[PDB]
Amino acid sequence: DSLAEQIAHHLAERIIRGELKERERIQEQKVTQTLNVSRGSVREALLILERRHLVNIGAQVSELSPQHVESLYALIVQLYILLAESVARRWRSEAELAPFLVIQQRLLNNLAQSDIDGFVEASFDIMRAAFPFANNPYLQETVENLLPAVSRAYHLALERRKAEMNQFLGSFAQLLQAVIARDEARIREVLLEYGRHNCQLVLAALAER
Amino acid sequence: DSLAEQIAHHLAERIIRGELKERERIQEQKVTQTLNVSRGSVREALLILERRHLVNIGAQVSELSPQHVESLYALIVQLYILLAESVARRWRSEAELAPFLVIQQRLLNNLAQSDIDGFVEASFDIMRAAFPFANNPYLQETVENLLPAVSRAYHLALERRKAEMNQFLGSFAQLLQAVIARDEARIREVLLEYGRHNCQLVLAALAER
Numbered sequence A, B: 001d002s003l004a005e006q007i008a009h010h011l012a013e014r015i016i017r018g019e020l021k022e023r024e025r026i027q028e029q030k031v032t033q034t035l036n037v038s039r040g041s042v043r044e045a046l047l048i049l050e051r052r053h054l055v056n057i058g059a060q061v062s063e064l065s066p067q068h069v070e071s072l073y074a075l076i077v078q079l080y081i082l083l084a085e086s087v088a089r090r091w092r093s094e095a096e097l098a099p100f101l102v103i104q105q106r107l108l109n110n111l112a113q114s115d116i117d118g119f120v121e122a123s124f125d126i127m128r129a130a131f132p133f134a135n136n137p138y139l140q141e142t143v144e145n146l147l148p149a150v151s152r153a154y155h156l157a158l159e160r161r162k163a164e165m166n167q168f169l170g171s172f173a174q175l176l177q178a179v180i181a182r183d184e185a186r187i188r189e190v191l192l193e194y195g196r197h198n199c200q201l202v203l204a205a206l207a208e209r
Helices: A003-016 A028-035 A039-051 A066-090 A094-112 A116-134 A137-160 A164-180 A184-207 B003-016 B028-035 B039-051 B066-090 B094-112 B116-134 B137-160 B164-180 B184-207
Strands: A059-061 B059-061
Touching: A003 A028, A003 A039, A003 A137, A028 A039, A039 A059, A066 A116, A066 A137, A066 A164, A066 A184, A066 B066, A066 B137, A094 A116, A094 A164, A116 A137, A116 A164, A137 A164, A137 A184, A137 B066, A137 B137, A164 A184, B003 B028, B003 B039, B003 B137, B028 B039, B039 B059, B066 B116, B066 B137, B066 B164, B066 B184, B094 B116, B094 B164, B116 B137, B116 B164, B137 B164, B137 B184, B164 B184
Parallel strands: none
Antiparallel strands: none
């Protein structure tokens, strides 16, 4: 990771968690002083965040809107189907799926700790554990570039409804079983159904701003 | 467009057209001298090309492989379906589809001129004319970031088979009619069928390297 990428990750986590609010301003000099970093690094960090849709170029934290949320979910669900179908076709031995079981345990541990921040962080390891099965650089880079925006929406859904962690775990368990069963019709059903549900929960939160 | 983006577009067109070959080296100083540009601009231009999958960081033009070609087509077909379905649902008056008819004429004009380079260039205006219907920044930026790689593969298919221009036009006409008919099942059929056909033509060319 370049220093620009480290700074962007730091600011992205603050936007994702709701610590930096919609329309809030980010000043280059304030970030340089708080983090003890070079100004050029901060400038590049903001360009990364803009590329990842989290800020508008100083910079201002981007606003959420229903059309962009719906846009994001319509796209990410098709990318997740592609990833999950590649795991379902390519896994050869059940040992290769063990990463998903460890993530299941990590999600449960964060739920036990009432840790929404860690729950979101661990959710993204699911995609990361799928990448070696797909060996698809275009898909991987696309998903990685969208993870901050997805994170931000997903975090808002959990801020609105803690029981969504229980809901996600139930759907994830169904997805894992469908991948184990190599059932592509069921994989698409689970992802499309949970995707629409989670999107509408984000929209409910947006409507209450 | 920044100067870095202009330089990257210039080098991308040379890779897309086959003027810069797989594994060929690009030297920063050679580009600065040929184009009369700043070295920092060229350095950033290469980072753009690497982000767009056209070079590995000097830099070397990336190699094509069957798994990456299949990866690219599996992804881009789902993105095209998303775009085409949004046009099919959102167009209100047939005047709004006129851009696609003009592109049809431009494709025919390049075919008449035996201009594969211009045919590829005009093909990408189809996606660009679809963006206002989708109003989907995530989808738009994803497609824009993949257009150079798609371009390169598509250009190789036409270098292998000029009659593919006639084939593309026939399929495009069917897609436009399905969009006019707001028939989403037919939209997916046309894009999936042409996608698999064009992908296998690229694979045929790869096998003959």
